[PDB]
């Protein structure tokens, strides 16, 4: 009906980091409804897309995308580690991400 979601709601939390050094090449991602590492294993390897808008239409779109994958889990609380084709800009900490259901195993 009015709902058309096929991906899972996710938050870009931060780069992988120590206390004072961060690694932009890896992003920490929250998955909605995942609070334990065991539930995060389902999403390992799944495609992720940060979807954003730009004022300049580039190739017939004003919506631009950066793609990535969930590479592994992070911590004890369901956060996952993610790498993107281009690293996320870091102004998107707390921004929304889309975790898709492909590549699928169920």
């Amino acid at each position: 009906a009015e709902s058309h979601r096929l991906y899972v709601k996710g938050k870009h939390l931060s780069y992988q980091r120590s206390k004072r050094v961060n690694n932009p090449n890896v992003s920490l991602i929250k998955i909605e409804g995942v609070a334990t590492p065991q539930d995060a294993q389902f999403y390992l390897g799944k495609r992720i897309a940060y979807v954003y808008r730009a004022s300049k239409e580039v190739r017939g779109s004003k919506i631009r995308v950066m793609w990535g994958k969930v590479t592994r889990t992070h911590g004890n609380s369901g956060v996952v580690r993610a790498t993107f084709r281009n690293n996320l800009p870091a102004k998107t900490f707390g921004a929304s991400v889309r975790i898709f259901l492909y590549p699928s195993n169920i």
Binding site: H4, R5, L6, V34, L101, P103, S104
Partner: protein
């Protein structure tokens, strides 16, 4: 000038590769999907739509149908990693499927000059749709609500957790 001819020279001929030891073995498909299984497409034009799985093709690609009469998805081929297999199974006995292959979906790619500056279906393909769909519809009617099941596109709803969601 610096030099009339460099003291060292590169190779003229293109190097040939040596024999690669990579044989192409057949794909091992996952057990959840067998011919007759109702799938859910995750990407493409028909993302979220429910199509039944019909045949495993030669290029590691699933062959599926809506049926087209039910939801507008023609006899098509999908990537196995872009579908979700469900426990709902309709018997695939009764519909002939041996005539479909990679040659069946031969494309005749466009040319470079052909370009959309401003901005059909073969009779055999549609006739094949009318044969497969009538044979598969005939079995769909045995399970009540299944024809209505196949028409409704799948979507995730607020609170639906795919890692816990059984299909």
């Amino acid at each position: 000038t610096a030099q009339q001819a460099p003291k060292w020279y590169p190779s003229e001929d293109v190097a040939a590769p040596k024999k690669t030891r990579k044989a192409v073995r057949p794909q091992k498909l996952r057990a959840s999907l067998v011919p007759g299984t109702v799938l859910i497409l995750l990407a493409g034009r028909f993302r979220g739509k429910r199509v039944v799985y019909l045949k495993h093709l030669e290029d590691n690609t699933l062959l599926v149908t809506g049926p087209f009469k039910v939801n507008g998805v023609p006899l098509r081929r999908v990537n196995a990693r872009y579908v979700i297999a469900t426990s709902t199974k309709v018997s695939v006995e009764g519909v002939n499927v041996e005539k479909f292959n990679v040659e069946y979906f031969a494309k005749e790619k466009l040319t470079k000059k052909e370009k959309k500056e401003a901005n059909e279906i073969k009779t055999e393909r549609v006739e094949d749709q009318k044969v497969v769909d009538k044979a598969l519809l005939a079995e769909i009617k045995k399970t009540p609500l299944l024809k209505q099941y196949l028409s409704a596109s799948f979507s995730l709803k607020n609170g639906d957790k795919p890692h816990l969601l059984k299909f």
